[PDB]
Design a protein around this ligand. Structure first.
Ligand code: 04C
Ligand code: 04C
Lengths: 238, 220, 248, 231, 244, 233, 202, 243
C-alpha cells in the first residue's frame, strides 16, 4: 500500500506493483487473438464501440511489409510503441536493404520497455501487443507485456475474458500447423467468439483481421473485407 | 631572450638576460625572466613574454595548492608534468620556451620545455633566440660535478655570449642558484652594459612650453 | 524524492505563500532598521546586533552596505543571505554603468533585485531569501529617495519606514513626528534617535548599539557618510535633554 | 545512474527559523573546543586534539591548516566538512593571487568562504556544513581573526572560543584578554582557555596550536608547544 | 528484518541496523523464481535451468533463460526476466568493447567484475532500483581453463565450482556437494545437472517444466553452445530414471 | 501524494482519469456527421451581460476543411489547436495537399500523454490536457467527425456529445439520428437537444454553430444565420 | 630519428639513435627514444617529440590501470592496441611512428609497428624514422631466421650506425635495450663503440 | 535532547536536533553486516594486514573470496563491510592512484590516497540522493620518504594514520588488545608485526586459525611491492606460534 506508487519501489514480497497495475490495462482492453500455421500468421481483433453510434475503435496496426500488431490497453501507449517498431524496421531496410527479423524487433521492444520500469518518475508502457510476422524462419506470433517480458507463441489471446479464448486455442493447437489460411482465420475468430457474452456474436462491424504470410504482405481487413471470412459462420454452441 | 640552466655538484644554476623586445625595439631593459615556481624550484622563460608570465604563474599556483595538500616540498617532475601537459594541450599556441630547474628530495633536476610540449632532461640546457651562442659555451667549457662558483661563472658566460651575439638579447645577467639547503636569487649578478653619460645638457627649462588651458584639482 | 520535497514554491489553500510568510517572520527577529527621507538628504539608522565586548570592528559598518557611488542600503534578516543580495546589487549597478555610462536610477536597481527575489518564490523549489532591505539614494530623475524590499520580491517607495524588530511600533511612532515636505536632515537624525531609543530593548542607548549613515549632496557629487562614535553620542544626549524637558 | 535533487533541504519554520542551520550549530557545539586570540602583534589559534587511543598517529592529520603563506584555519565540529572548506578556501586564495599578484586580504578570503557556506543553506539536495571556522591572517601590517559559521555569517573577533563549553570559554577570555598583549602571552592564555575545557591533562601531542604574524602563518612544532606547556 | 517506516522504500536509505532493504527485496525476486544451476567441470562449464511453462500455448524455446554474451561466454539467469535481458545486453556490450579496444576475447573474471560494478550502481540511489536478477557466467579457455561466476542483485561477484540460484537454491546445493566436479568430464556433468533439476523441481505445486541446457568447454572448442537435442534428450531420460 | 505517471490498481492513470472529470465541468458540445457535411454546436454559457459573447470562441477553424469544437478547461486547448494548425500548414508545405481529418486528429492525439516529472525537457508538460475535442471536417473519404479525449484515444463518430450534459445528449442523439438524414435536419436536431440540456434559455447569442461540407469551406454562423434556425420552437 | 626492434627467441632487442632536431639544429644530442611503458614493454619514438611523448604517457597511464584491474602481467599486443587506438583516432593531428616491442608470459617476445596512419602489424624486425630509409637494403640482406640475442644486438647496432652515418636527422649515440623473462638490460655505445664502417672512396 | 528526531533526519543525510547524521551512523553498523574483522599492524620496516577468510562450502572457489586488494604496486588495502560497496571503493582508489601519477609524475603516498577516498566519502555525507558506502578501507605501503604507513578511512569521511588498527565486528575489542601490546615496548620486526596481527585476530575471536581461514598481506622496506602471503607461508607463521 506504500510500495505501489513508483516503479523503483520493491515490495517486501519481491514484487513491483506499478508494473503489475500496468498489466491490468491489458486486461481492461478489448480481447484479441493471434495464431500461426506453417505459412501464415493471422491476427483477429474484437473492436469496441464507446457508445454504439461512434465507430468501432481501431485494433490492428501496420509496422512493416512483413510485421503487423494487435493492441490491448492504452491506445496512446500503443501508438508510441508502434512508432518505435516502425522506426526500427525502416532503419533495417535503409542500412541492410533486408527485412528486420521479427525475433530481433521483439527483443528491441524488450529492452525499450525495460528502461522506464527502473527509473524514478517513470511508468511502464500500459499496453500489450500481439505481433504477427513472416521472415526466413517462417510465421511468428509474439506477445509483449507492460513488464518488458516477451513470449514466442503457437497461439495467444489477450484482453477481457481472453481466458475462454485461450482454452479454445489450447484445444485446437494440434491442428494449426498443417491447416490452411481459410481454416486458420476460422479458428482465430472462433476463439474471439468465445470471449463475447452469449447474447451478441461476431459481425462485420466488430471484427478486424490482420494476415501476413508466405505469398502476401501484411493486410488489414475491416468492414466489407471481413465478410468472406464470416461467410462460413459455423454458429455458436454452448 | 637568452636563458640557460646547469646541473652542478650541489644543485642547479639558472641564468637569463633582461631584454624584452617589441618588434626590433627594446621595450624593457630590465625584466625578470627567472620565475618563482616554488621555494625550491625556479623556471626561466623565453618567447612570448605574456605567455611566459601567465604559464609560469598558473603552475606555481597549482603547485602551492598541491604542496599545501601533501604537506611536502614539491617535486621538479610535477612542475615538469604540469607545464608539459598544458603547453601540449594548446598545440604550441602558448609561445613559452622554458628552462626548469630545482632541488628535490630526489636531488637536483634540470629540464627544457618547448612550446609544443616536448621535454628534455639534461645536465645543461639553453632556450631562447640566443640559445645557440649559450649552448656553444656549455659544449666547450662544461664539466661534470663542478663547484658552485665555477658553475655561476659558466652560466653567466653562456648568457653573456647570448647577450653580445643575439640581437634579441641584452642588458643584465640574472642568476638563480638552488642547492639542498640554500637559494640565491641574484638579480643583477652582472651589469656588462651601461648607458654612456650625457655630457651635453638638454634640460628644458621652466616656461619653455606654451600652455592653452590649465585646471588644478586639489585632493586629500 | 518527492517524499523529501517540502514544496517551497507552492500555493496555500488560503491563496498565499507559506515560505514567504515564514521568511517575513525571520525579519522580525533581526535588528530594528529604519530610514527616513528629508529635503536636504536621506539617512539610514539601524540597531547593531554585534555588540559583544570581544568583537574587533574591522569594517566601516555592520548593516549599512555601499552599492553605488550615489546609492546605499541597509539590511534586516539573515546576514548571509544579505551578503548575496548586496553583492548582486553592486553587480547590477555596474552592468548599467557599463551599458549606459550613467549611474543606475534608484527604482531600476531595486526592481532588478526584486525580480530575482520574486523568481525564488515562483520556480526552482528553493527557500526564499530571508532578507528585507532599505535603499537610500539619489538620481537625476527623482532626487533623494528611500525604498523597501521584501522576501516576496515586493518593493515600495517611502518618505519614512522601518523594518525588522518592532517594525509596527516604530512606524506609528514615525507617523507621529514626520512632517512631509518640511523635514530636514537635522531633525531627521533627531527623529531617528527618538524612535530607536524607545523601540530597542536597551533603555540607555549607547553609540555602540546603533549605526547611522547619511546620504547628502555636496557641490555636484553625492556623499555617503557613516556617522562617527562621538557624532552619535552627541545626537543621543541631545535626545535626553528633550526627554528630561518633558516635565511640562 | 546518478541524478541530484533540486529542492532545498533547509527551509523556514512557522516561527521563521532555519532549522537545519540551528541543528548544524548544535553539531559544532559538540565538537572539540578551539580558541582564537588577536594580539595586535600576531594571532594565535589553538585547538583540543584529544586523540583517544595513542594507536592513532598525532602527526598524520591536522586540525590547524594553512590556507596560504599568511592565512590559517581551525575548526569546531565535523572533521570531514572542514577539510572540504580548507581545499575550497585554498582555491579561492589562489584565484585571487592569479588575478591581482598580491596576497589575498583575510577579510576578502572569509567573505568568499562564507559565500560557499551560504550556498549550502539554499542550494538543492544538500545539508549545511556542521563546522564553524576560525580564520587568522596578517595583511597591511595588521593581524586578523574571523569566525565563519554554518549559515555563512562572519564576525571579526579580538578573542573567541567555540566547540564544547564555548560559553565558559568566552567568559574566561573576556576576563583574561588584554587588547595589548603580545604573541607570547596570547599563546599562553590560548592554552589556558583550552585548559578550562579539557579534562585529562595536556601533552604537546594532546593539543594543536598555530601562530600568525608579519613573518607569516605557521603551525607550532611539538617542541614549541611543550615549552609553552610548562604552565 | 522488519522496520519499514521509511528505510525500506529507497535504495539510498539505510535501516537503523545498517541494511539496504530494497536490495534484499530485489533478492526476494530471485528467491521466488525457478531454480538455475551451473557446474564447473575439468574441461568446461555446464548450465541447467528449470523453465516453468505458464501455458502450453508457448513455443518450446520461448522465455529462454540461457544467453550468449560473447562467442565464448554463457549466461544463465534467475529472477525478473526483463532485468535479466537488459543485463545480458550490458554484458554483450562490455564484451564487445573489450574486443574493439584490446583485440581479444574478454577474460571472464574481468567481464564479471565490470558487469557487477554496473549491478552495484543500481543499489545506491533513489533515482533507480536494483536489478531483480541473479545471473551466472561461464567460459572455457585453453590458457585459463574452466571458469564460473555468479552475480546477485547487490553486485557481489564470486567464482564457483558449483552454484545454484532460484526457488530451491539451498535444496540444489546439497545435491551438487555430492559431486566430484574437479575430476568429471562435461559429458557426464550434463547427466548430473539434469538429475539435480528434476529432483529439485516441485511436481505437485508447480506444473510441467522444460529443461534448458548449455555448455562451453573442450568438447565445444571453447565456444558457448546449446547442448544438442540428442544429448539433452539422453540426460532427460537419465534424470527420470533416477526417480526410481 | 504520488507522481503524475502513477497507475491505479485498475490499470488507469490517476491524472488522466481526473482530466476526464474536468470535461464533466465544461460546457456541452454536439457534433453530427452526415452525408452532406458536418455540423458542430456548443453552448457559450455567459455569466454576465457585460461579457462580450463574440469573444468566447469554443469552435475554431484549423484549416478551410477542418473545424474543431472543444469542452472543458478552454485554456488548455490553446496549444492543442495551435499544434493542429501548424501540422496542417506543414503538410501543405511538404506534400502540396491538405491533411485528412484523421491525420490531424492523430497528430494532436500524440500530444495527450506527453506529460511527466523526472527525465523531462526545459518546458515539458506537467499534467494531461483537461479538454475533449470534436474534429469536424471533409476530405477524400467524404465528411467525418472525430472525438479525442485526454487519454489520447481518438475515434470516428456519427454523432457525439461532450460536456457536462453529455449524458442526456448522447441518448437523445441515439433516438433522432438516422445514418441518412440531411444537414438541415442535423443542425435542427443538435440545437433542439442543446436547448433541452442548457440551464440558460437558447437564443442567437449564447450558442455557436459551424458547418463544413464537401461543397464549401468551414463556415461560422453569424447572428442572422442562427436566427434562421432558432425560430423553430 | 632512426629506430629499430628485433624479435628473438626469449624476448626482444630495441635500438635507437640519440638525436633530436629543431630544423637543422640538434636540440638534444643524447636522447632516450626508448620509452618504458611497463615492466617488460617498451616503445620506440619517431616523429614529433611532443606528440609521441604525450601518447606514450597516456598509454602508460592506460596500461597501468588495465594491468592492475586485470591482475595479469600486461600483453605486448594490448600495449600496441592502446597505441593503435590513439594513433588512428588522432592520425590527422599527430606525427608519430611508433614501434612497440616487449615480453609477456603468454606470447613471449613481440615487435609491433604503428606507422603514421595508425595501422598495426607484427613483424620479426621493424625499422622506423627518417634514417630507416637508408638501411632497407642492408636490413633485408643481413637478416637471418632465428638469430640469437647477442646477434640481434649486433644486428641493430650495425644497421643504426649505417643509418646515422648517412642521415642528417640521425646521429649521436646508439641506445640498446634487451628485454626477456628475467627483465630489462640497457647499454649505451659511445664514439669508438659505434661499429665503424670506414669512409669508402678513392 | 538525546535520541531526538525531526522530519526525515533518519532517512537522508540531514541534521538531527542534536547535530548528528543518523544515516552515516547506520552506515557504520553496515560494516559489521559482513561479520568479519580486519587487523592492521605497523612494524619498524614493514606493514601487515590480516583478515578473516570465511569460505562456508566446497562449492565456492576460495581464490576469488578475498578482502585484500592491490591498488598500486606499492599500496595495498583491506576492505571491511559490504562486499559490493568495497569493490567499488577499490576501483575508485585504483583510478585516483593512477590519475595522480599521470598528473604529478610520482606515485601517490598512502597519506594522500586515504585522504582522497575520505574526501569522496564526504560527498555522500552531505548529499541526500545517495547513501554512504557501508564499508571501511585500511591502506598500507612504504612511503619513499617517511617509511611504513597504515591509514584508515571511514564512511563518515574521517581518515587517520595508525601505529595499529582494526575494523569490523570485534574492532573495539581488538584495538584494546593492540593498546596493551603497543604500550609494551617490543622490537617491531617483521616476525613480531605479522604475529601480533594474527594473535590479535586469534584471541579476539577465540579460534586458533587454520591457514585457509585467514588472509595476510604485507609490505616491506626490502620489498615495497604489495604481497599476499598464500596458505603455505601463512602456515609457516602459524607453526612458529607454537611456543
Ligand atoms: C627574447 C627577448 C626574444 O628575442 C625573449 O624571448 C623574451 C622573453 C621575455 C621577455 C620579457 C619578459 C618575460 C620573458 N621575448 C620577448 O621579449 C617578446 C618577443 C616576441 C615578440 C613577438 C612574438 O611573436 C609571437 C614572439 C616573441 N616580446 C614580447 O612579448 C612583446 C613585449 N610583446 C609583443 O610583441 C606582442 N605580441 C605578443 C604575441 O602576439 C603578437 C603580439
Ligand atoms: C628524428 C631526429 C627526426 O625524424 C626523430 O624522428 C625525432 C623523434 C624524437 C625526438 C625526441 C624524443 C623522441 C623521439 N624527431 C625530432 O627530433 C623532431 C622532428 C620533427 C619536428 C616536427 C614534426 O612535425 C610535427 C615532426 C618531426 N623534433 C621535435 O619534435 C622538436 C623537439 N620540436 C620542434 O621541431 C618544434 N616544431 C614542432 C612542429 O612545428 C614546428 C616547430
Amino acid at each position: 500500500n506504500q510500495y505501489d506508487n513508483d516503479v523503483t519501489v520493491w515490495s517486501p514480497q519481491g514484487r513491483i506493483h506499478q508494473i503489475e497495475y500496468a498489466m491490468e490495462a491489458v486486461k481492461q482492453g478489448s480481447a484479441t487473438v493471434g495464431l500461426k500455421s506453417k505459412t501464415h500468421a493471422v491476427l483477429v481483433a474484437l473492436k469496441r464501440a464507446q457508445s454504439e453510434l461512434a465507430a468501432h475503435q481501431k485494433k490492428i496496426l501496420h509496422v512493416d511489409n512483413h510485421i503487423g500488431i494487435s493492441i490491448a490497453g492504452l491506445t496512446a501507449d500503443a501508438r508510441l510503441l508502434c512508432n518505435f517498431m516502425r522506426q526500427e524496421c525502416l532503419d533495417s531496410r535503409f542500412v541492410f536493404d533486408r527485412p528486420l527479423p521479427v525475433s530481433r524487433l521483439v527483443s528491441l521492444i524488450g529492452s525499450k520497455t525495460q528502461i522506464p520500469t527502473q527509473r524514478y518518475g517513470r511508468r511502464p508502457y500500459g499496453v500489450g501487443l500481439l505481433i504477427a510476422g513472416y521472415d526466413d524462419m517462417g510465421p511468428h506470433i509474439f506477445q509483449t507485456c507492460p513488464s518488458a517480458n516477451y513470449f514466442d507463441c503457437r497461439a495467444m489471446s489477450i484482453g477481457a475474458r481472453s481466458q475462454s479464448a485461450r482454452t479454445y486455442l489450447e484445444r485446437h493447437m494440434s491442428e494449426f500447423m498443417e491447416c490452411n489460411l481459410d481454416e486458420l482465420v476460422k479458428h482465430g475468430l472462433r476463439a474471439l467468439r468465445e470471449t463475447l457474452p452469449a447474447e451478441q456474436d461476431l459481425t462485420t462491424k466488430n471484427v478486424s483481421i490482420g494476415i501476413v504470410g508466405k505469398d502476401l504482405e501484411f493486410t488489414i481487413y475491416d468492414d466489407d473485407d471481413v465478410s468472406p471470412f464470416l461467410d462460413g459462420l459455423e454458429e455458436r454452441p454452448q | 631572450t637568452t636563458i640557460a640552466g646547469v646541473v652542478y655538484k650541489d644543485g642547479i644554476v639558472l641564468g637569463a638576460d633582461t631584454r624584452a623586445t617589441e618588434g626590433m625595439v627594446v621595450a624593457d631593459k630590465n625584466c625578470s625572466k627567472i620565475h618563482f615556481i616554488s621555494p625550491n624550484i625556479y623556471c626561466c622563460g623565453a618567447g612570448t613574454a605574456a605567455d611566459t608570465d601567465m604559464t609560469t604563474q598558473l603552475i606555481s599556483s597549482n603547485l602551492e595548492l598541491h604542496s599545501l595538500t601533501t604537506g611536502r616540498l614539491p617535486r621538479v617532475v610535477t612542475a615538469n608534468r604540469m607545464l608539459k601537459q598544458m603547453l601540449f594541450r594548446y598545440q604550441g599556441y602558448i609561445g613559452a620556451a622554458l628552462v626548469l630547474g630545482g632541488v628535490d628530495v630526489t636531488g637536483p633536476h634540470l629540464y627544457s620545455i618547448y612550446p609544443h610540449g616536448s621535454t628534455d632532461k639534461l645536465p645543461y640546457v639553453t632556450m631562447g633566440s640566443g640559445s645557440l651562442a649559450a649552448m656553444a659555451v656549455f659544449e666547450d667549457k662544461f664539466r661534470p660535478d663542478m663547484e658552485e662558483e665555477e658553475a655561476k661563472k659558466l652560466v653567466s658566460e653562456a648568457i653573456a655570449a647570448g647577450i653580445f651575439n643575439d640581437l634579441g638579447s641584452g642588458s643584465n645577467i640574472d642568476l638563480c642558484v638552488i642547492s639542498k639547503s640554500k637559494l640565491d636569487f641574484l638579480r643583477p649578478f652582472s651589469v656588462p652594459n651601461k648607458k654612456g653619460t650625457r655630457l651635453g645638457r638638454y634640460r628644458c627649462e621652466k616656461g619653455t612650453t606654451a600652455v592653452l588651458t590649465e585646471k588644478v584639482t586639489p585632493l586629500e | 524524492s518527492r517524499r523529501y520535497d517540502s514544496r517551497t514554491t507552492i500555493f496555500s489553500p488560503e491563496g498565499r505563500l507559506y515560505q514567504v510568510e515564514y521568511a517575513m517572520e525571520a525579519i522580525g527577529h533581526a535588528g530594528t532598521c529604519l530610514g527616513i527621507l528629508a529635503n536636504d538628504g536621506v539617512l539610514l539608522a539601524a540597531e547593531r546586533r554585534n555588540i559583544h565586548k570581544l568583537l574587533d570592528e574591522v569594517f566601516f559598518s555592520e548593516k549599512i552596505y555601499k552599492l553605488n557611488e550615489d546609492m546605499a542600503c541597509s539590511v534586516a534578516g539573515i546576514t548571509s543571505d544579505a551578503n548575496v543580495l548586496t553583492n548582486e546589487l553592486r553587480l547590477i549597478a555596474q552592468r548599467y554603468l557599463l551599458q549606459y555610462q550613467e549611474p543606475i536610477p534608484c527604482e531600476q536597481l531595486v526592481t532588478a533585485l526584486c525580480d530575482i527575489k520574486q523568481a525564488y518564490t515562483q520556480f526552482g523549489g528553493k527557500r526564499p531569501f530571508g532578507v528585507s532591505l532599505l535603499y537610500i539614494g539619489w538620481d537625476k530623475h527623482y532626487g533623494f529617495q528611500l525604498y523597501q524590499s521584501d522576501p516576496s520580491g515586493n518593493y515600495g517607495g517611502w518618505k519614512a519606514t522601518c523594518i525588522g524588530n518592532n517594525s509596527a511600533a516604530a512606524v506609528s511612532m514615525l507617523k507621529q513626528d514626520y512632517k512631509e515636505g518640511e523635514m530636514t536632515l537635522k531633525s531627521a537624525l533627531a527623529l531617528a534617535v527618538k524612535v530607536l531609543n524607545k523601540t530597542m530593548d536597551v533603555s540607555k542607548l549607547s553609540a555602540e548599539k546603533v549605526e547611522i549613515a547619511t546620504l547628502t549632496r555636496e557641490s555636484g557629487k553625492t556623499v555617503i557618510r557613516v556617522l562617527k562614535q562621538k557624532e552619535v553620542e552627541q545626537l543621543i544626549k541631545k535626545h535626553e535633554e528633550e526627554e528630561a524637558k518633558a516635565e511640562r | 545512474a546518478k541524478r541530484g535533487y533540486s529542492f532545498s533541504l533547509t527551509t523556514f519554520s512557522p516561527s521563521g527559523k532555519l532549522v537545519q542551520i540551528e541543528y548544524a550549530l548544535a553539531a559544532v557545539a559538540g565538537g572539540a573546543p578551539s580558541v582564537g586570540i588577536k594580539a595586535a602583534n600576531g594571532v594565535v589559534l589553538a585547538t583540543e586534539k584529544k586523540q583517544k587511543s595513542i594507536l592513532y598517529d598525532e602527526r598524520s592529520v591536522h586540525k590547524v591548516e594553512p590556507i596560504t603563506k599568511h592565512i590559517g584555519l581551525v575548526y569546531s565540529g565535523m572533521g570531514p566538512d572542514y577539510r572540504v572548506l580548507v581545499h575550497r578556501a585554498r582555491k579561492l586564495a589562489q584565484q585571487y593571487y592569479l588575478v591581482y599578484q598580491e596576497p589575498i586580504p583575510t577579510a576578502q578570503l572569509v567573505q568568499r568562504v562564507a559565500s560557499v557556506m551560504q550556498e549550502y543553506t539554499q542550494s538543492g539536495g544538500v545539508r549545511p556544513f556542521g563546522v564553524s571556522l576560525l580564520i587568522c591572517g596578517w595583511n597591511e601590517g595588521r593581524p586578523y581573526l574571523f569566525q565563519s559559521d554554518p549559515s555563512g555569517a562572519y564576525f571579526a573577533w579580538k578573542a573567541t572560543a567555540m566547540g564544547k563549553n564555548y560559553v565558559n570559554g568566552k567568559t574566561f577570555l573576556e576576563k583574561r584578554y588584554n587588547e595589548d598583549l603580545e604573541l607570547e602571552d596570547a599563546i599562553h592564555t590560548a592554552i589556558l582557555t583550552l585548559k578550562e575545557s579539557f579534562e585529562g591533562q595536556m601533552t604537546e601531542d594532546n593539543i594543536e596550536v598555530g601562530i600568525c604574524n608579519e613573518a607569516g602563518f605557521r603551525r607550532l612544532t611539538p617542541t614549541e608547544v611543550r615549552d609553552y606547556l610548562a604552565a | 528484518s522488519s522496520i519499514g517506516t521509511g528505510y525500506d522504500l529507497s535504495a539510498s536509505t539505510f535501516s537503523p541496523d545498517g541494511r539496504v532493504f530494497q536490495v534484499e527485496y530485489a533478492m526476494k525476486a530471485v528467491e521466488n523464481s525457478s531454480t538455475a544451476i551451473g557446474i564447473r567441470c575439468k574441461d568446461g562449464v555446464v548450465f541447467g535451468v528449470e523453465k516453468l511453462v505458464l501455458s502450453k500455448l508457448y513455443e518450446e524455446g520461448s522465455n529462454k533463460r540461457l544467453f550468449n554474451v560473447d562467442r565464448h561466454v554463457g549466461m544463465a539467469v534467475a529472477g525478473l526476466l526483463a532485468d535479466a535481458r537488459s543485463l545480458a545486453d550490458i554484458a554483450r556490450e562490455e564484451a564487445s568493447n573489450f574486443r574493439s579496444n584490446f583485440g581479444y576475447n574478454i577474460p571472464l573474471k574481468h567481464l564479471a567484475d565490470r558487469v557487477a560494478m554496473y549491478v552495484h550502481a543500481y543499489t545506491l540511489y533513489s533515482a533507480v532500483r536494483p536489478f531483480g536478477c541473479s545471473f551466472m557466467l561461464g567460459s572455457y579457455s585453453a590458457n585459463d581453463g574452466a571458469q564460473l561466476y555468479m552475480i546477485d542483485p547487490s553486485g557481489v561477484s564470486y567464482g564457483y565450482w558449483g552454484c545454484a540460484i532460484g526457488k530451491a537454491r539451498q535444496a540444489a546445493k546439497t545435491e551438487i556437494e555430492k559431486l566430484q566436479m574437479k575430476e568429471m568430464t562435461c559429458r557426464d556433468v550434463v547427466k548430473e545437472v539434469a538429475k539435480i533439476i528434476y529432483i529439485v523441481h516441485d511436481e505437485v505445486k508447480d506444473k510441467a517444466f522444460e529443461l534448458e541446457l548449455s555448455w562451453v568447454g573442450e568438447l565445444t572448442k571453447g565456444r558457448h553452445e546449446i547442448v544438442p537435442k540428442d544429448i539433452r534428450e539422453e540426460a532427460e531420460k537419465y534424470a527420470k530414471e533416477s526417480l526410481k | 501524494d504520488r507522481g503524475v505517471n502513477t497507475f491505479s490498481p485498475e490499470g488507469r492513470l490517476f491524472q488522466v482519469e481526473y482530466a476526464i472529470e474536468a470535461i464533466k465541468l465544461g460546457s456541452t458540445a454536439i457534433g453530427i456527421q452526415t452525408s452532406e457535411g458536418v455540423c458542430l454546436a456548443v453552448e457559450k454559457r455567459i455569466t454576465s451581460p457585460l461579457m462580450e459573447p463574440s469573444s468566447i470562441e469554443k469552435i475554431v477553424e484549423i484549416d478551410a476543411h477542418i473545424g474543431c469544437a472543444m469542452s472543458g478547461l478552454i485554456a488548455d486547448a490553446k496549444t492543442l489547436i495551435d499544434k493542429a494548425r501548424v501540422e496542417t500548414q506543414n503538410h501543405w508545405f511538404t506534400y502540396n495537399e491538405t491533411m485528412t481529418v484523421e491525420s490531424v486528429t492523430q497528430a494532436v492525439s500524440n500530444l495527450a500523454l506527453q506529460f511527466g516529472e523526472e527525465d523531462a525537457d526545459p518546458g515539458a508538460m506537467s499534467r494531461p490536457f483537461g479538454v475533449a475535442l470534436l474534429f469536424g471536417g471533409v476530405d477524400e473519404k467524404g465528411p467525418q467527425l472525430f472525438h479525442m479525449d485526454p487519454s489520447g484515444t481518438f475515434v470516428q463518430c456519427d454523432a457525439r456529445a461532450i460536456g457536462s450534459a453529455s449524458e442526456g445528449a448522447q441518448s437523445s442523439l441515439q433516438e433522432v439520428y438516422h445514418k441518412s438524414m440531411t444537414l438541415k435536419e442535423a443542425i435542427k436536431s443538435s440545437l433542439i437537444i442543446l436547448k433541452q440540456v442548457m440551464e440558460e434559455k437558447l437564443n442567437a447569442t449564447n450558442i455557436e454553430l459551424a458547418t463544413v461540407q464537401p461543397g464549401q469551406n468551414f463556415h461560422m454562423f453569424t447572428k442572422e444565420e442562427l436566427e434562421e434556425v432558432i425560430k423553430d420552437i | 630519428t632512426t629506430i629499430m626492434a628485433v624479435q628473438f627467441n626469449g624476448g626482444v632487442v630495441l635500438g635507437a639513435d640519440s638525436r633530436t632536431t629543431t630544423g637543422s639544429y640538434i636540440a638534444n644530442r643524447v636522447t632516450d627514444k626508448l620509452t618504458p611503458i611497463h615492466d617488460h614493454i617498451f616503445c620506440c619514438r619517431s616523429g614529433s617529440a611532443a606528440d609521441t611523448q604525450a601518447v606514450a604517457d597516456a598509454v602508460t597511464y592506460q596500461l597501468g590501470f588495465h594491468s592492475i584491474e586485470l591482475n595479469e602481467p600486461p600483453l605486448v599486443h594490448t600495449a600496441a592496441s592502446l597505441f593503435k587506438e590513439m594513433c588512428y583516432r588522432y592520425r590527422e593531428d599527430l606525427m608519430a611512428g611508433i614501434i612497440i616491442a616487449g615480453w609477456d608470459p603468454q606470447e613471449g617476445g613481440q615487435v609491433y609497428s604503428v606507422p603514421m596512419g595508425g595501422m598495426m602489424v607484427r613483424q620479426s624486425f621493424a625499422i622506423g624514422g627518417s634514417g630507416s630509409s637508408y638501411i632497407y637494403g642492408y636490413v633485408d640482406a643481413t637478416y637471418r631466421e632465428g638469430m640469437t640475442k647477442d646477434e640481434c644486438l649486433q644486428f641493430t647496432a650495425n644497421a643504426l650506425a649505417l643509418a646515422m652515418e648517412r642521415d642528417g636527422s640521425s646521429g649521436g649515440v646508439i641506445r640498446l635495450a634487451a628485454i626477456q623473462e628475467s627483465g630489462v638490460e640497457r647499454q649505451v655505445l659511445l664514439g669508438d663503440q659505434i661499429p665503424k664502417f670506414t669512409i669508402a672512396t678513392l | 535532547s538525546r535520541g531526538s528526531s525531526a522530519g526525515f533526519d533518519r532517512h537522508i543525510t540531514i541534521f538531527s536536533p542534536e547535530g548528528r547524521l543518523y544515516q552515516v551512523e547506520y552506515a557504520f553498523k553496515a560494516i559489521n553486516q559482513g561479520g568479519l574483522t580486519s587487523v592492521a599492524v605497523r612494524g619498524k620496516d614493514c606493514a601487515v594486514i590480516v583478515t578473516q577468510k570465511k569460505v562456508p562450502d566446497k562449492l565456492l572457489d576460495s581464490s576469488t573470496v578475498t578482502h585484500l586488494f592491490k591498488i598500486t604496486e606499492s599500496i595495498g588495502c583491506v576492505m571491511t563491510g559490504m562486499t559490493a560497496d568495497s569493490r567499488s571503493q577499490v576501483q575508485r582508489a585504483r583510478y585516483e592512484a593512477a590519475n595522480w601519477k599521470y598528473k604529478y609524475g610520482y606515485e601517490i603516498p598512502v597519506d594522500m590516497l586515504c585522504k582522497r577516498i575520505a574526501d569522496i566519502s564526504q560527498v555522500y555525507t552531505q548529499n541526500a540522493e545517495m547513501r554512504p558506502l557501508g564499508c571501511c578501507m585500511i591502506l598500507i605501503g612504504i612511503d619513499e620518504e617517511q617509511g611504513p604507513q597504515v591509514y584508515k578511512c571511514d564512511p563518515a569521511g574521517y581518515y587517520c594514520g595508525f601505529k595499529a588498527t582494526a575494523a569490523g565486528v570485534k574492532q573495539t575489542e581488538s584495538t584494546s588488545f593492540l593498546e596493551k601490546k603497543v604500550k609494551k615496548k617490543f622490537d617491531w620486526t617483521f616476525e613480531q608485526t605479522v604475529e601480533t596481527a594474527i594473535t590479535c585476530l586469534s584471541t579476539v575471536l577465540s579460534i586458533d586459525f587454520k591457514p585457509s581461514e585467514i588472509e595476510v598481506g604485507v609490505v616491506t622496506v626490502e620489498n615495497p611491492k604489495f604481497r599476499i602471503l598464500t596458505e603455505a607461508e601463512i602456515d609457516a607463521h602459524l607453526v612458529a606460534l607454537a611456543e
